[PDB]
Coordinates of C-alpha atoms and ligand atoms in Angstrom, one line a residue:
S1 CA -111.6 263.4 255.4
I2 CA -109.1 262.5 257.9
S3 CA -110.4 263.2 261.1
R4 CA -107.1 262.1 263.4
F5 CA -103.6 261.7 263.1
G6 CA -103.4 259.5 266.5
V7 CA -104.5 256.8 268.3
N8 CA -106.7 258.5 270.6
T9 CA -110.7 258.3 269.9
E10 CA -111.1 261.1 272.6
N11 CA -109.0 263.1 270.2
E12 CA -111.5 263.3 267.1
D13 CA -114.0 264.5 269.2
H14 CA -112.0 267.2 271.1
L15 CA -109.9 268.1 268.1
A16 CA -113.8 268.6 265.8
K17 CA -114.8 270.6 269.0
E18 CA -111.6 273.1 269.5
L19 CA -112.1 273.7 265.1
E20 CA -116.1 274.4 265.8
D21 CA -113.8 278.1 266.5
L22 CA -112.3 277.7 263.4
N23 CA -113.6 281.5 261.8
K24 CA -112.5 282.9 265.7
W25 CA -109.8 284.7 266.6
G26 CA -110.4 283.2 269.7
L27 CA -109.6 279.7 268.5
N28 CA -106.7 277.8 270.7
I29 CA -104.3 276.6 268.5
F30 CA -102.2 275.0 271.4
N31 CA -104.9 272.7 271.9
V32 CA -105.3 272.3 268.1
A33 CA -102.0 270.5 268.1
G34 CA -102.9 268.7 271.3
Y35 CA -105.9 266.8 269.9
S36 CA -104.0 266.2 266.7
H37 CA -101.2 264.9 267.4
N38 CA -99.5 267.5 267.3
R39 CA -100.0 268.1 263.9
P40 CA -101.6 271.4 264.1
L41 CA -100.3 273.2 260.7
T42 CA -101.5 269.9 258.4
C43 CA -105.0 270.2 260.5
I44 CA -105.7 273.7 260.5
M45 CA -104.8 274.2 256.7
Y46 CA -107.2 271.1 255.7
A47 CA -109.9 272.8 257.6
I48 CA -109.3 276.1 256.1
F49 CA -109.4 274.7 252.6
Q50 CA -112.7 272.9 253.5
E51 CA -114.6 275.7 254.9
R52 CA -114.1 277.8 252.4
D53 CA -114.2 275.4 249.6
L54 CA -110.6 275.8 248.2
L55 CA -109.8 271.9 247.4
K56 CA -113.4 272.2 244.9
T57 CA -112.6 275.6 243.7
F58 CA -109.3 274.7 242.4
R59 CA -109.5 270.7 241.9
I60 CA -106.8 270.6 244.6
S61 CA -107.4 266.2 246.1
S62 CA -107.3 266.0 249.4
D63 CA -104.3 263.3 249.1
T64 CA -102.2 265.7 247.5
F65 CA -102.7 268.8 249.9
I66 CA -102.4 266.2 253.3
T67 CA -98.5 264.9 251.7
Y68 CA -97.5 268.0 250.7
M69 CA -99.2 270.1 254.3
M70 CA -98.1 266.7 256.2
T71 CA -94.1 267.4 254.0
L72 CA -94.7 271.6 254.8
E73 CA -95.4 271.5 258.6
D74 CA -92.1 268.6 258.8
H75 CA -89.8 271.2 257.7
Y76 CA -90.8 272.9 260.8
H77 CA -87.9 272.1 263.2
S78 CA -89.6 270.9 266.1
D79 CA -86.7 271.8 268.4
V80 CA -87.2 275.8 267.9
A81 CA -89.0 277.1 270.4
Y82 CA -91.2 280.1 268.5
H83 CA -90.7 279.2 264.9
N84 CA -92.0 276.2 264.9
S85 CA -95.4 274.7 263.7
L86 CA -97.5 276.3 265.6
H87 CA -96.6 279.4 264.9
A88 CA -97.3 278.7 261.1
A89 CA -100.6 277.2 262.2
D90 CA -101.5 280.6 263.9
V91 CA -100.7 282.7 261.3
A92 CA -102.5 281.0 258.8
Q93 CA -105.7 280.5 260.9
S94 CA -105.4 284.3 261.8
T95 CA -104.8 284.8 258.5
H96 CA -108.0 283.1 257.4
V97 CA -110.3 285.3 260.1
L98 CA -108.9 288.5 259.0
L99 CA -109.8 287.5 255.0
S100 CA -113.1 287.8 256.6
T101 CA -113.3 290.4 258.2
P102 CA -116.9 293.1 257.3
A103 CA -114.9 295.9 255.3
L104 CA -113.2 293.7 253.0
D105 CA -115.6 291.5 252.0
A106 CA -116.2 290.4 248.3
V107 CA -113.1 292.7 247.9
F108 CA -110.5 289.3 247.7
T109 CA -110.5 287.3 244.5
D110 CA -110.7 283.4 245.5
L111 CA -106.7 283.1 243.8
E112 CA -105.8 286.3 246.4
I113 CA -107.6 284.2 249.5
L114 CA -105.4 281.1 248.2
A115 CA -102.3 283.2 248.0
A116 CA -103.2 284.2 251.1
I117 CA -103.4 281.2 253.7
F118 CA -100.6 279.6 251.5
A119 CA -98.1 282.2 252.3
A120 CA -99.1 282.5 255.8
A121 CA -98.4 278.4 256.3
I122 CA -94.8 278.4 254.4
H123 CA -93.9 282.0 255.7
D124 CA -91.3 281.0 258.5
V125 CA -90.5 277.2 256.7
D126 CA -87.5 275.3 257.3
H127 CA -86.4 278.6 260.4
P128 CA -83.6 277.5 262.4
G129 CA -84.0 279.9 265.0
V130 CA -81.9 283.0 264.8
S131 CA -82.1 285.8 263.1
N132 CA -81.0 287.2 259.3
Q133 CA -78.5 289.3 262.1
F134 CA -76.9 286.6 263.4
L135 CA -77.1 284.6 259.5
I136 CA -75.3 287.3 258.5
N137 CA -72.6 288.2 261.4
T138 CA -72.0 284.6 261.2
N139 CA -70.9 284.2 257.5
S140 CA -73.4 281.3 257.4
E141 CA -74.8 279.5 254.4
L142 CA -77.6 281.0 254.0
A143 CA -76.4 284.7 254.4
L144 CA -73.9 283.5 251.3
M145 CA -76.5 282.3 249.5
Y146 CA -79.0 285.3 249.5
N147 CA -76.2 287.9 249.8
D148 CA -77.3 289.0 253.8
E149 CA -80.6 290.4 251.8
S150 CA -84.3 288.9 253.8
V151 CA -82.1 285.9 254.0
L152 CA -84.6 283.6 256.1
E153 CA -87.6 284.8 254.3
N154 CA -85.9 284.3 250.7
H155 CA -85.5 280.8 252.1
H156 CA -89.1 280.0 253.4
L157 CA -90.2 280.9 250.1
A158 CA -87.6 278.9 248.1
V159 CA -88.3 275.8 250.5
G160 CA -91.9 276.2 250.5
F161 CA -91.6 276.4 245.8
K162 CA -89.2 273.6 246.0
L163 CA -91.8 271.2 247.5
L164 CA -94.5 271.8 245.0
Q165 CA -92.0 270.1 242.2
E166 CA -93.0 266.8 242.8
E167 CA -96.1 265.4 241.1
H168 CA -97.4 263.8 244.9
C169 CA -97.0 267.4 246.0
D170 CA -98.1 269.6 243.9
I171 CA -101.0 271.0 245.4
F172 CA -101.4 273.4 242.3
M173 CA -101.3 271.2 239.4
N174 CA -104.6 272.1 238.0
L175 CA -104.3 275.8 238.4
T176 CA -103.7 277.2 235.1
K177 CA -100.3 278.7 234.4
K178 CA -101.3 281.9 234.5
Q179 CA -102.7 281.2 237.9
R180 CA -99.8 279.3 238.6
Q181 CA -97.8 283.0 237.9
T182 CA -99.9 285.4 239.5
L183 CA -99.5 283.5 242.8
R184 CA -96.5 283.0 243.1
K185 CA -95.8 286.5 242.4
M186 CA -98.3 287.4 245.3
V187 CA -97.0 284.8 247.8
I188 CA -93.3 286.0 247.3
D189 CA -94.2 289.7 248.2
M190 CA -96.3 288.3 250.9
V191 CA -93.9 286.5 252.4
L192 CA -90.5 289.3 251.7
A193 CA -92.8 291.4 253.7
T194 CA -92.6 289.6 257.0
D195 CA -88.4 290.7 256.6
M196 CA -89.5 293.1 260.5
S197 CA -86.4 294.9 258.8
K198 CA -89.2 296.4 256.4
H199 CA -91.7 296.6 258.9
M200 CA -91.4 300.8 259.2
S201 CA -91.7 301.4 255.7
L202 CA -94.7 298.7 255.4
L203 CA -96.7 300.5 257.8
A204 CA -95.6 304.2 256.2
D205 CA -97.1 303.0 252.8
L206 CA -100.3 302.0 254.8
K207 CA -100.8 305.1 256.5
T208 CA -100.9 306.6 253.5
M209 CA -103.1 304.0 252.1
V210 CA -105.2 304.6 255.0
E211 CA -105.4 308.5 254.5
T212 CA -107.2 308.1 251.1
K213 CA -109.2 305.4 251.4
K214 CA -112.4 304.7 250.0
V215 CA -115.1 302.8 251.9
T216 CA -117.9 302.7 249.4
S217 CA -121.4 303.5 250.4
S218 CA -122.4 300.0 251.2
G219 CA -119.5 299.8 254.3
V220 CA -117.2 298.3 252.2
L221 CA -113.4 299.2 251.4
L222 CA -112.9 299.8 247.2
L223 CA -109.7 298.6 246.4
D224 CA -110.0 299.1 242.4
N225 CA -107.2 297.6 241.2
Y226 CA -104.0 295.2 242.2
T227 CA -101.6 296.9 242.9
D228 CA -104.2 298.3 246.6
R229 CA -105.2 294.7 247.0
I230 CA -102.1 292.9 247.0
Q231 CA -100.7 295.9 249.5
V232 CA -103.5 295.4 252.1
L233 CA -103.0 291.1 251.4
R234 CA -99.4 292.3 252.9
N235 CA -100.2 294.1 255.2
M236 CA -102.9 291.5 256.8
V237 CA -100.3 288.8 256.6
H238 CA -97.9 290.7 258.3
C239 CA -100.5 291.9 261.2
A240 CA -101.2 288.1 261.7
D241 CA -97.6 287.0 262.7
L242 CA -97.6 290.3 264.9
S243 CA -101.6 289.1 266.2
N244 CA -100.0 287.4 269.3
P245 CA -100.4 290.2 271.3
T246 CA -104.0 290.8 270.2
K247 CA -105.1 287.2 271.4
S248 CA -106.1 286.0 275.0
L249 CA -103.9 287.1 277.6
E250 CA -103.9 282.6 278.4
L251 CA -102.2 282.8 274.6
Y252 CA -100.4 285.6 274.4
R253 CA -98.0 284.4 277.4
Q254 CA -97.5 281.0 276.1
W255 CA -96.3 282.9 272.5
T256 CA -94.0 285.4 274.8
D257 CA -92.3 282.4 276.9
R258 CA -92.0 280.6 273.7
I259 CA -89.9 283.5 271.7
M260 CA -88.4 284.2 274.5
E261 CA -86.9 280.8 274.9
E262 CA -86.0 281.4 271.5
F263 CA -84.4 284.7 271.7
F264 CA -82.2 283.3 274.9
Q265 CA -81.2 280.5 273.2
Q266 CA -79.6 283.1 270.0
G267 CA -78.3 284.9 273.1
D268 CA -76.5 282.2 274.7
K269 CA -74.7 280.6 271.3
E270 CA -73.5 284.2 270.7
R271 CA -71.6 283.7 273.8
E272 CA -70.3 280.9 272.7
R273 CA -69.3 282.6 269.7
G274 CA -67.5 285.5 271.2
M275 CA -69.9 287.7 269.2
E276 CA -71.7 290.5 270.6
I277 CA -74.6 289.3 272.4
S278 CA -78.0 291.2 271.1
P279 CA -79.4 292.8 274.4
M280 CA -82.8 291.4 274.0
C281 CA -81.1 288.1 273.7
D282 CA -79.6 287.9 276.9
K283 CA -81.0 286.0 279.5
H284 CA -79.0 287.3 282.4
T285 CA -80.1 290.9 281.5
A286 CA -83.2 290.9 279.5
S287 CA -86.7 291.7 280.7
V288 CA -89.3 289.5 279.6
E289 CA -92.2 292.4 280.3
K290 CA -90.6 295.4 279.5
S291 CA -89.7 293.6 275.9
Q292 CA -93.3 293.0 275.8
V293 CA -94.4 296.5 276.4
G294 CA -91.7 298.0 274.4
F295 CA -92.6 295.8 271.3
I296 CA -96.1 296.8 271.8
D297 CA -96.2 300.4 272.2
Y298 CA -93.0 300.5 269.2
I299 CA -94.6 297.7 266.8
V300 CA -97.6 296.3 267.6
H301 CA -100.1 298.9 268.6
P302 CA -98.7 301.4 265.4
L303 CA -99.8 298.6 263.3
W304 CA -102.8 297.3 264.4
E305 CA -104.2 300.9 265.4
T306 CA -103.4 301.6 261.5
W307 CA -105.5 298.5 260.4
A308 CA -108.2 299.4 263.4
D309 CA -108.5 302.3 260.9
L310 CA -108.3 300.7 257.7
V311 CA -111.1 298.4 258.7
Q312 CA -113.1 300.4 261.3
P313 CA -114.7 299.3 262.8
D314 CA -114.3 295.7 262.4
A315 CA -110.9 295.5 264.5
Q316 CA -112.2 297.6 267.8
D317 CA -112.1 294.4 270.0
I318 CA -108.1 293.2 269.2
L319 CA -107.0 297.1 270.1
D320 CA -108.4 296.9 272.9
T321 CA -107.7 293.2 274.1
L322 CA -103.8 294.7 273.1
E323 CA -104.2 297.6 275.3
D324 CA -105.9 295.2 278.1
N325 CA -102.2 293.1 277.5
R326 CA -99.9 296.1 277.5
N327 CA -101.5 297.3 280.6
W328 CA -100.6 293.8 281.9
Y329 CA -97.2 293.1 281.1
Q330 CA -96.2 296.5 282.5
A331 CA -98.3 296.0 285.7
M332 CA -95.7 293.0 286.0
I333 CA -93.0 295.4 285.9
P334 CA -92.1 296.0 289.1
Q335 CA -90.8 299.9 289.2
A336 CA -93.1 303.0 288.1
Ligands
ZG2_401 C1 -94.7 287.3 271.7 C2 -94.7 288.3 270.7 N1 -93.9 288.2 270.0 N2 -94.3 288.3 268.5 C3 -93.3 288.2 267.9 C4 -92.4 288.8 268.7 C5 -90.8 289.8 268.2 N3 -90.6 289.5 266.9 C6 -90.9 288.7 265.7 C7 -89.4 288.6 265.2 C8 -89.6 287.8 263.7 O1 -90.3 288.6 262.9 C9 -91.9 289.2 263.3 C10 -91.3 289.8 264.6 C11 -90.5 290.2 269.3 C12 -89.1 290.7 269.2 N4 -88.3 291.4 267.9 C13 -87.5 292.2 268.2 C14 -86.3 292.7 267.5 C15 -86.8 292.3 266.2 O2 -87.7 293.1 265.3 N5 -86.2 291.1 265.3 C16 -85.4 289.7 265.9 C17 -85.3 289.2 264.5 C18 -86.3 289.4 264.1 C19 -86.3 290.7 263.8 C20 -87.5 292.7 269.7 C21 -87.1 293.7 270.7 C22 -87.8 294.9 270.7 C23 -87.7 295.6 269.3 C24 -88.4 297.1 270.0 C25 -88.9 297.7 270.8 C26 -89.3 296.2 272.1 C27 -88.3 294.9 271.5 O3 -88.8 291.8 270.2 C28 -91.4 290.1 270.5 N6 -92.4 289.7 270.9 C29 -93.2 289.0 269.9
ARS402 AS1 -107.5 268.2 261.1
ARS403 AS1 -93.4 265.1 248.1
ARS404 AS1 -82.1 289.6 270.5
MG405 MG1 -90.4 285.3 259.8
ZN406 ZN1 -93.5 284.6 261.3

């Protein structure tokens, strides 16, 4: 059991202290990064897998796990403001919390739980800090590889799975062939669903499933076939990716600042290229505060409201936090 990645003895204690909140929505991943010598994804993933006895269940060597995770973390760009390993850490930890919501208790197999957390870990790996549309419009190598379709998301999967090809890093070595086959299918499905161009349709289908839901007597959702299970899993990882506004205001505000740095930097590159400036990426005109109000009203609230419906009453405190945070950014807009 590794307990630090740095030279600071005070950090072993501070890290173990922060990790007492592993199973909680209120964990502070920024502090985890500070106390792990900037290894939030390696350390959180290590903590999650031990908490769930996944290294034991799936006969994954601690040594191989750490080596794979360090290397995956190293393929996130630390010079990208938002889509770096802290984001991946956050989404994996958020997914670990959502998997334990009481409504889904006993629903998922171990393989499925494993797929979901691994999918969260890999889901933005090697992100270059610009959008699919910027890659397509600049005729980039990635858009030429992937034929303009879910360019980044296909890339994130490719990198994640390609890193398992070296024996020293193959954390899934002791799964069976069929297990590996099913996990791959599941992870591909979940990561491709994080493409925002698919959100409107994913929400429609999720609403449509909330409508016909069958909460069994003991309070647990009945999700009887693979199709229903993978559909909840894809929406869970999506919610987790879109969870920043549902966290304490102190955390949300730092997340907002990072995504706007990244977005504004894309705006600048576009200007440098004489391209049309994407309006939300334009630092000279766009309002951070309106963008968040807009993003919640149009995208985050409708999704979480629908998730809450599904897991009722598990998600009520998230919903209220969101509404508070929304109200907080509105009140920062100087006009009406
Ligand atoms: C800080 C809160 N937060 N977290 C994510 C996010 C966000 N976009 C993410 C982009 C990657 O995939 C998941 C969503 C945006 C955001 N994205 C867009 C456009 C979009 O969806 N893109 C761009 C590139 C990737 C997909 C906006 C602009 C916007 C649209 C509609 C209503 C209000 C604002 O804001 C704002 N706050 C975020
Ligand atoms: As750790
Ligand atoms: As390796
Ligand atoms: As933009
Ligand atoms: Mg992504
Ligand atoms: Zn993401």
